[PDB]
């Protein structure tokens, strides 16, 4: 009893924002509080941020 | 309060560089450099690609016959293309290339106002004999990181569907580090000299960088200043 | 490239020997920029008189 069926495939590129779950391979889990600017990110003596 | 001036300016690599200001009072290296780096890592003019239209393609998620590089990876290779413009702000390049072999960034036809700091870059590899690519790259000036998702609000009626937006990353500077040690002035017991080692992308010269950093820093005090 | 120039928004004072200052709008990180700079200056180097040694 159906005339036609039009399927549409959408491709959504989703970035990483506060609220997404992150985890390692050892059972450590967490959710991202906020994306902190590069200027405010702690760095080492060589100047490479973390 | 002796006023500082730049002394040592030697750019070792096409990207790496070093700058230095010796005449600082006691413990001014931190005060000055930790703010100069915060200014550099956020506020620089730069230049980046915003719009890209490959002639055969309609959307980024697809392939093209002859090219072993996915359109997605092509655009990601386009985000890391260093370029410098002076006269205008909006500038559209023309990239037409055929034949087998990796397509370098030097295959772009030069425009009256453009320059490439590293043509050895690679847009994509071409594995077919008769495969040809014609793409118009839209580059412009800005400041900071502007992703494409946020960009579609003013929306300027972009008519043809074949226009693919790419994330814009105007960031001339890539890294900064600063050290301070006492280099004795002619008449001073201990004065700290500040050396800022840095890693650029090759577009903005290391001198205009620090001068504009001072510009953007001093402009913030305009609440309390007339002229000195 | 232009920039976002801040104006003084408000000033409050609990007394003559104490005060608070507010500055907005700023740019991301600029808050910390000026805060750290001025805090360094005021805490570590400032022209003023004091008492040094007493016998």
């Amino acid at each position: 009893g159906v005339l036609k069926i039009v399927k549409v495939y959408l491709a959504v590129k989703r970035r990483i924002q506060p609220g997404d779950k992150m985890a390692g391979r050892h059972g450590n889990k967490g959710v991202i509080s906020k994306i902190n600017p590069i200027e405010d990110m702690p760095y080492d003596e060589n100047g490479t941020p973390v | 309060f002796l006023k500082p001036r730049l002394v040592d300016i030697e750019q070792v690599s096409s990207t790496h560089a070093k700058v230095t200001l010796e005449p600082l009072e006691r413990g001014f290296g931190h005060t000055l450099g930790n703010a100069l780096r915060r200014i550099l890592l956020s506020s620089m003019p730069g230049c980046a690609v915003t719009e890209v239209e490959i002639d055969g393609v309609l959307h980024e998620y697809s392939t093209k016959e002859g090219v072993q590089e996915d359109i997605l990876e092509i655009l990601l290779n386009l985000k890391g293309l260093a370029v410098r413009v002076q006269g205008k702000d909006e500038v559209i390049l023309t990239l037409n290339k055929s034949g087998i072999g990796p397509v370098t960034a030097a295959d772009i036809t030069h425009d009256g106002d453009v320059e490439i700091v590293k043509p050895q870059h690679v847009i994509c590899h071409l594995t077919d004999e008769n495969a040809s690519i014609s793409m118009r790259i839209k580059v412009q000036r800005g400041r900071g990181y502007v992703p494409a998702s946020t960009r579609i609000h003013s929306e300027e009626d972009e008519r043809p569907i074949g226009r693919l937006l790419v994330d814009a990353c105007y960031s001339p500077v890539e890294r900064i580090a600063y050290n301070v040690e006492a280099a004795r002035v002619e008449q001073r017991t201990d004065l700290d000299k500040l050396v800022i080692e840095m890693e650029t992308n090759g577009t903005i010269d290391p001198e205009e960088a620090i001068r504009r950093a001072a510009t953007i820093l001093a402009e913030q005090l305009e609440a309390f200043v007339d002229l000195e | 490239t232009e920039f976002l120039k801040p104006r003084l928004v408000d000033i409050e004072q609990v007394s003559s020997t104490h005060a608070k200052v507010t500055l907005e709008p700023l740019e991301r990180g600029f808050g910390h920029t000026l805060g750290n700079a001025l805090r360094r200056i005021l805490l570590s180097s400032m022209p003023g008189c004091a008492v040094t040694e007493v016998e």
Side-chain angles (χ1 to χ4, degrees), chain A, chain B residues 2-152 156 158 160-183 189-224, chain C:
Chain A
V2 48
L3 290 184
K4 299 160 57 181
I5 301 183
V6 182
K7 292 185 176 183
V8 187
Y9 294 70
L10 287 69
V12 195
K13 226 145 51 185
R14 288 176 179 173
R15 261 179 296 164
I16 182 174
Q17 59 170 314
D20 289 4
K21 182 164 185 171
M22 222 110 296
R25 291 177 292 187
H26 309 264
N28 41 10
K29 50 217 300 181
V31 232
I32 305 180
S33 63
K34 187 233 302 179
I35 49 179
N36 191 70
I38 323 90
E39 324 95 46
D40 302 50
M41 281 279 78
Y43 48 75
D44 64 332
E45 70 178 292
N46 295 129
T48 24
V50 165
Chain B
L2 357 96
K3 294 154 68 176
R5 303 196 75 211
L6 60 159
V7 43
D8 210 57
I9 22 76
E10 47 103 2
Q11 189 172 355
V12 40
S13 182
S14 182
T15 159
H16 192 286
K18 294 187 65 173
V19 266
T20 300
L21 282 75
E22 187 168 325
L24 307 187
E25 289 289 342
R26 171 244 329 281
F28 270 70
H30 335 294
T31 313
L32 293 167
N34 190 72
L36 281 171
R37 64 179 318 284
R38 184 163 255 91
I39 296 297
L40 296 172
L41 292 170
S42 65
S43 318
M44 301 301 320
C47 275
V49 176
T50 52
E51 306 163 37
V52 170
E53 182 157 17
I54 313 180
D55 203 71
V57 193
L58 292 189
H59 43 60
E60 321 93 70
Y61 324 95
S62 63
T63 62
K64 182 182 178 64
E65 192 145 48
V67 56
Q68 69 164 298
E69 221 102 326
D70 263 16
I71 303 301
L72 219 276
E73 192 177 17
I74 297 180
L75 288 183
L76 273 83
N77 294 333
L78 280 180
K79 188 192 301 180
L81 175 63
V83 68
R84 175 167 54 186
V85 203
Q86 42 194 338
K88 319 183 190 68
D89 288 333
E90 316 280 32
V91 51
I92 312 182
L93 281 52
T94 325
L95 188 282
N96 281 238
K97 173 64 178 303
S98 62
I100 310 185
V103 179
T104 49
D107 267 300
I108 324 175
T109 313
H110 259 280
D111 189 300
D113 180 12
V114 75
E115 184 201 329
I116 304 299
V117 320
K118 231 265 179 175
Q120 288 67 20
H121 203 53
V122 43
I123 276 68
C124 67
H125 293 182
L126 207 46
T127 59
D128 209 334
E129 303 188 357
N130 52 275
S132 58
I133 4 178
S134 298
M135 55 177 61
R136 320 196 327 273
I137 300 179
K138 215 258 190 299
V139 180
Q140 53 190 209
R141 225 178 306 269
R143 193 164 87 259
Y145 174 72
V146 181
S149 67
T150 68
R151 291 225 287 110
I152 171 185
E156 283 72 12
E158 66 169 7
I161 288 73
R163 270 196 171 275
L164 292 318
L165 286 58
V166 327
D167 281 10
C169 180
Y170 329 96
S171 182
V173 306
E174 160 101 333
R175 181 234 284 166
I176 283 109
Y178 69 123
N179 59 271
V180 287
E181 181 198 344
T189 37
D190 49 357
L191 297 185
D192 305 300
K193 168 234 292 186
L194 161 80
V195 175
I196 28 186
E197 185 178 355
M198 70 160 63
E199 196 90 25
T200 332
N201 80 316
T203 307
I204 284 296
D205 57 85
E207 190 183 49
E208 178 187 325
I210 279 65
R211 195 164 303 283
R212 250 203 192 87
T215 332
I216 275 61
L217 207 179
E219 256 179 317
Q220 295 306 101
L221 300 317
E222 251 175 329
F224 23 81
Chain C
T1 178
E2 210 142 28
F3 234 91
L4 196 162
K5 296 169 181 52
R7 310 275 209 176
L8 182 74
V9 47
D10 178 16
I11 207 288
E12 177 192 13
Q13 25 197 164
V14 184
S15 68
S16 137
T17 180
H18 178 287
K20 284 184 286 180
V21 193
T22 53
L23 194 69
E24 66 171 339
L26 269 290
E27 304 286 77
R28 62 154 51 198
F30 277 48
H32 273 284
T33 307
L34 283 74
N36 186 32
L38 278 43
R39 203 214 91 256
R40 294 231 82 213
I41 294 183
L42 299 200
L43 253 185
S44 297
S45 68
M46 209 57 180
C49 262
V51 183
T52 327
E53 325 286 349
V54 181
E55 54 118 336

